[PDB]
Amino acid sequence: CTFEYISDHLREFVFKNKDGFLYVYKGYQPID
Amino acid sequence: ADYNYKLPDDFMGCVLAWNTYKYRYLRHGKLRPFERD
Numbered sequence: 678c679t680f681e682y683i684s685d686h687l688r689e690f691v692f693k694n695k696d697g698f699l700y701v702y703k704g705y706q707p708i709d
Numbered sequence: 710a711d712y713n714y715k716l717p718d719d720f721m722g723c724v725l726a727w728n729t730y731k732y733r734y735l736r737h738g739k740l741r742p743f744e745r746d
């Protein structure tokens with residue numbers, strides 16, 4: 678195995694995957 | 710370039726090789742670029 682990364686209300690995400698890359702987007706909203 | 714290592718057709722980069730171990734031959738389907746099995 679290859680990859681490793683350790684780093685230091687409605688929560689919304691979008692996960693997209695293309696060209697061997699996983700894009701992640703993130704939003705937040707203070708409120709079914 | 711079919712079951713082992715595929716490059717996309719918008720490539721910006723350089724390809725290098727010089728003179729100096731298995732390789733896949735049977736799988737179900739193609740590959741997407743920059744993906745491995």
Ligand SMILES: *[C@@H]1O[C@H](CO)[C@@H](O)[C@H](O)[C@H]1NC(C)=O
Nearest residue numbers: 736737738739740741742744
């Ligand atoms: C992704 O992996 C699955 C394994 O179930 C395979 O069926 C699929 O064909 C793979 N993707 C491509 C583009 O071959």
